[PDB]
Each structure stands twice: as C-alpha cells, then as structure tokens.
C-alpha cells in the first residue's frame, strides 16, 4: 500500500488541505489500532509441527502423503506428508518445512530463492504515468491496442475470437521516450513489470543466457498478468548469442501456450535487427518513436518546466522553434541545466535567457566534428 497522489504541486492551501485530510485519516488509523479462540486448531497442528521446524527442498511426491525431501546437509529422506499441507502447492524444487525429529512434511514455505530475477521483478513502476508523457499519441494508441487493452479488456478479443497480438518492438532515436512509455504502460495497468537491460542477458557462462531468459519467462508466467521489457534488444538483436536469440524466439513463438505475459522490446538500431527476431507471427506491432515535433516539443517543455518556478519573460516558443533537432531527454537536459544556471546567479526563478543559453550550450555539446 502507498499514499494517495496529491495533485497540486505549487505551494497552495489546496495541497495543504489534501495533506491534513491524509493526516486525519492516518491519525484515525493510529486511534483505532491503539484502542485495543482457535486454540484447538493451534494445539493440533502447531503442536504436531513441534518447534523448531527445519527447512528443506521437495524433490518428488510418490504417494498421496509420501514424498522425498532433501535438506541442507544434502541427505535424502522418504518422509510422510501431514494432511494439512496443500498438495497443489507442492512441486519439485519447492521449499518445505519439516518436523525436526521425524522430518515429516509440515507445510510449504513461500519461495525466497532465485535472487537475481527476484530483483529484476522491480514492480516499482509508480514513478510515471501516461500523464508524464505528452504528444506520443499514435504510439500510445498502438501500444494500448497491442498490450494494454488485451490485459485490461481481453473480453473484446475473446468475443471477436481474436488471439491478441503477442509481441511489440519500439524503435527510434534514443531519448524519445521508449523506456518512459514502457514504464508508463506498466503503471497504467498494474500488471507486474519485468525489465532486463539488453547486454545484461549476454553472459560469460554458456548456459547462463538462455537459462536466464528461460527463468525470466518462468517468473513472468508465474506472476501471470505480466509485462516484460527488454531495452536495447540490439545488444542481442543484431553461435552462443544466436542460441540465446533462438531461445527467446522459441519462448515467444514455440511450443506450449504462453498465456498472458506481454513483451515490449526497445531498440535504437531497428534496421540492424536480424529477420528471425522480428517475427511477423509474433512481432506484428512495430512502433516508431520519431524525434518530437513542434507540438510535442512544446508539450515536453511544459511537462518538465512545470515543476520549476518560472519568471514572466520566458517565451517558450523561441525554445520550441527551429527544427526537430533534439529529443525529450535533451529537453529535460535543457530544463535541468537552465535550473542550475539560474541557481548560480542566485535565481530560484529561472528566466528566458537562462533557457536560451541552456539550449545554446546543449546544442554545443550536441554532436561534434571538424568542419
């Protein structure tokens, strides 16, 4: 659980009122909690599992209540299963609690292994929203139709008899908002978000690449409604690395039924992509991210400078004008550096000239080369 989002950002008493509303509610929480049976069930089960209980691994289930369990010493024991253990929650590789004296299975322990993919499960999408992105409307509708609508409303596709699209590639110059759009769609539909950065699936170990992608899809399907993001797919996209490609392509198209997990893959060099990975059967949605135009640039300037204190003299149009020379990330860079420049000369209220010299210096640092 998390706090509500207070949506004035200028210092106004509306922001205050929302805040003291929240304080009121949390204070009622405090009040309520401070102003303060099944011993039969406990006396049977939690006394049968006499403390302490060891933790081991389940290998096989042989009978209805008989299973093989290994422990951290590595020994193997054919033990019985007490009736209260959920059989459907038991499978090879599962962590199981065991009676200390007689090693009898006394319950399943929720998994705490596979650390790395557990970290890349992130789920920490809520920093952005479709709000934070402006002007990418065509891309927004495309990705909504491809991945967001089938997750939010698969009813349309099931009623239509349609098997939903099962792969999306995002492409364009860097800093156009591909990663931002992926995070934003992860935020709009609260399906679990999976991110893995390109080259990081390339590994020294021969198996580790395909193994890593296999376990990532395994955890994704385990979370069921999930979105997996591979940024800079080019690192793999453009024998061992080709074998990781084959693993990913078969995880996309191949045997079994994948189900609900969606795949977003972002590239900066789409034309260098190999034909196999761009599967017409799987990857039917390619979304271009062009360099922002005048309207989009204006929207990005408003979005980013919105949280900054601004003077009256700022004429945003001369910043917007000229051509499509730069992307949204460059716009954020101009906003930030204009903030610093206003800070040096001691303005907490950035002016037009600040942005003018900021864009000039950025264009100086933008590209290079002898005449």
């Amino acid at each position: 659980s998390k706090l509500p989002l207070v949506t004035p950002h200028t210092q106004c008493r509306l922001k205050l009122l929302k805040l003291e509303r929240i304080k009121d509610y949390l204070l009622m929480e405090e009040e309520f909690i401070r102003n303060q049976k099944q011993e039969e069930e406990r006396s049977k089960v939690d006394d049968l599992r006499g403390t302490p209980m060891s933790v081991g691994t389940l290998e096989e289930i042989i009978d209805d209540n008989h299973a093989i369990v290994s422990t951290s010493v590595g020994s193997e024991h054919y033990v019985s299963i007490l009736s209260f253990v959920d059989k459907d929650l038991l499978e090879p590789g599962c962590s199981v609690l065991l009676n200390h004296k007689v090693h009898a299975v006394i319950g399943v322990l929720m998994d705490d292994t596979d650390p790395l993919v557990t970290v890349m499960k992130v789920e920490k999408a809520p920093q952005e929203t479709y709000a934070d992105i402006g002007g990418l409307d065509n891309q927004i509708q495309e990705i909504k139709e491809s991945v967001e609508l089938p997750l939010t409303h698969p009813e349309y596709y099931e009623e239509m008899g349609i098997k939903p699209p099962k792969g999306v590639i995002l492409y364009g110059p860097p800093g156009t908002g591909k990663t931002l759009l992926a995070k934003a769609v992860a935020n709009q539909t609260s399906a679990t978000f999976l991110r893995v950065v390109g080259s990081e699936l390339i590994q020294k170990y021969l198996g580790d690449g395909p193994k890593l992608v296999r376990e990532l899809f395994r955890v994704a399907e385990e979370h069921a409604p999930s979105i997996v993001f591979i940024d800079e797919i080019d690192a793999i996209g453009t024998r061992e690395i080709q074998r990781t490609m084959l693993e990913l392509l078969n995880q996309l198209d191949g045997f079994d039924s994948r189900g609900d997990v969606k795949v977003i893959m972002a590239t900066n060099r789409i034309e260098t992509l190999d034909p196999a990975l761009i599967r017409p059967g799987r990857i039917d949605r390619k979304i271009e991210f062009p360099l922002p135009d005048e309207k989009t640039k204006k929207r990005i300037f408003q979005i980013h400078t919105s949280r900054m204190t601004l003077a009256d003299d700022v004429t945003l149009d001369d910043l917007i004008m000229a051509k499509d020379d730069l992307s949204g990330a460059d716009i954020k860079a101009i906003c930030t550096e204009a903030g610093l420049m206003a800070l040096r000369e001691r303005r907490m209220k950035v002016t037009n000239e600040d942005f003018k010299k900021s864009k000039e210096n950025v264009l100086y640092k933008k590209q290079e080369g002898t005449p």
């Binding site: 706090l3 805040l19 929240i22 304080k23 949390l26 204070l27 929480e29 405090e30 909690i33 401070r34 069930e41 049977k44 089960v45 049968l48 093989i68 020994s75 193997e76 024991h77 054919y78 033990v79 019985s80 007490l82 009736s83 209260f84 253990v85 959920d86 059989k87 929650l89 038991l90 609690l97 009676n99 007689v102 090693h103 009898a104 319950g107 399943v108 322990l109 929720m110």
Partner: protein
C-alpha cells in the same frame, strides 16, 4: 514529516505481516490419524 513518522508508527503498531504456511482449508485435514502415523511410522532415508 508527520506523514512519514505516522506511517512508521502505524507500521510498527500493526507489526509485521503474517507470511504463513500451507494449511489447507481447516475442515479438510488433521484427524488423529496424522499424529498417529507421525509417531508410528519411520522417516526413511534414501540410499543408492
């Protein structure tokens, strides 16, 4: 800051969340047969 500190106070007051175990629906399981088998049978080890 009161938001943050009151959140932490709520968290410490409610305590940690019960991670729990298996324990299939209560009417489904137990019987004295469970404990009788536990105290009667043998936890066999496995050997090649």
């Amino acid at each position: 800051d009161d938001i943050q500190q009151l959140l932490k106070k709520i968290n410490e007051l409610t305590g940690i969340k019960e991670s729990d175990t298996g324990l299939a629906p209560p009417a489904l399981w137990d019987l004295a047969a469970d404990k009788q088998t536990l105290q009667s049978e043998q936890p066999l080890q496995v050997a090649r």
